[PDB]
Design a protein around this ligand. Structure first.
Ligand SMILES: NC[C@H]1O[C@H](O[C@H]2[C@H](O)[C@@H](O[C@H]3O[C@H](CO)[C@@H](O)[C@H](N)[C@H]3O)[C@H](N)C[C@@H]2N)[C@H](N)C[C@@H]1O
Ligand SMILES: [Mg+2]
Length: 268
């Protein structure tokens, strides 16, 4: 029997989501199982659970981000540069690999979208505009990003069947960790500025592993290692949402733990 919105809302309440909360979801729709009206049922349930004063923030990215195609170059390669679509926050689809729910979130009426094409974040609620801007190239997940503001806004990370690798906020810990050997990447994104496409090349922390030992293609990366340790060490509300084992994590606490975890293991 497909899960109804009301059932999901009651499950979210049982897990500890309260009216007014600031929630960042990471969802495995396969784990959740069939929904009465598809993924929108869970989006609607999340919005109802946080209520009209609550907020949702999601890391949605962009289906067509030219990350791999520009990585490591000081400028976009010529063929990429000529024909790639500029990122248009109103129309650019979300990246499927971070969750199929994200396209439903980003298309929800009133959703706001951040300007960073690769790190794009979507937000719903009264504080959405404050969450999503600024979001500048060179500030993907660290200071001055939407994640930074989420962490200052009592954020909760709602993992619905997602693994420990899924915790985007822990890229903030990587950004600020006082450790030697941190990896950086250079890439280029096509932005709209006053209606025109402008290529911007930037560097930022490597979000595929902050040190060499965390940068294997298949992992585990530092986010996964930190989150697994944290979850083995901390009381965290656990329970079902749909068919999915879910957890509700204090974001500031896990990020503080992650900064300490990295700094304990790696010389300054
Ligand atoms: N390195 C291992 C991890 O790789 C992925 O996550 C990571 C993604 O690969 C990162 O994505 C970035 O790198 C990928 C891969 O090149 C690009 O497709 C993407 N546009 C770009 O944003 C994203 N910015 C952060 C995320 N933690 C897996 N989802 C989880 C895994 O633990
Ligand atoms: Mg408020």
């Amino acid at each position: 029997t497909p899960w109804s919105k009301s059932e999901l809302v009651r499950q979210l309440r049982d897990l500890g989501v309260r009216s007014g909360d600031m929630v960042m979801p990471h969802v495995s729709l396969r784990a959740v199982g069939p929904l009465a009206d598809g993924p929108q049922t869970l989006v609607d349930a999340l919005i109802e659970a946080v209520g009209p004063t609550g907020n949702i923030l999601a890391f949605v990215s962009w289906r067509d981000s030219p990350y791999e195609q520009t990585l490591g170059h000081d400028a976009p390669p010529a063929a990429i540069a000529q024909s790639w679509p500029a990122f248009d926050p109103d129309h650019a689809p979300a990246y499927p690999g971070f969750g199929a729910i994200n396209e439903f979130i980003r298309t929800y009426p009133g959703c706001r979208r951040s300007a960073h094409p690769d790190a794009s974040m979507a937000a719903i609620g009264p504080d959405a505009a404050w969450l999503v801007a600024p979001h500048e190239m060179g500030a993907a997940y660290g200071p001055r990003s939407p994640i930074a503001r989420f962490l200052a806004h009592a954020g909760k990370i709602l993992s619905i069947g997602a693994g420990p690798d899924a915790v985007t906020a822990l890229h903030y810990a990587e950004a600020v960790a006082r450790i030697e050997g941190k990896r950086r990447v250079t890439y280029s994104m096509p932005l709209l500025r006053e209606g025109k496409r402008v290529w911007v090349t930037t560097s930022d922390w490597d979000s595929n592993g902050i040190l060499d030992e965390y940068a294997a293609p298949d992992g585990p990366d530092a986010v996964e290692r930190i989150a697994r340790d944290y979850l083995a060490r901390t009381r965290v509300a656990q329970g079902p949402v749909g068919g999915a084992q879910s957890r509700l994590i204090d974001a500031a606490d896990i990020v503080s733990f992650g900064i300490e975890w990295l700094e304990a293991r790696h010389a300054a």
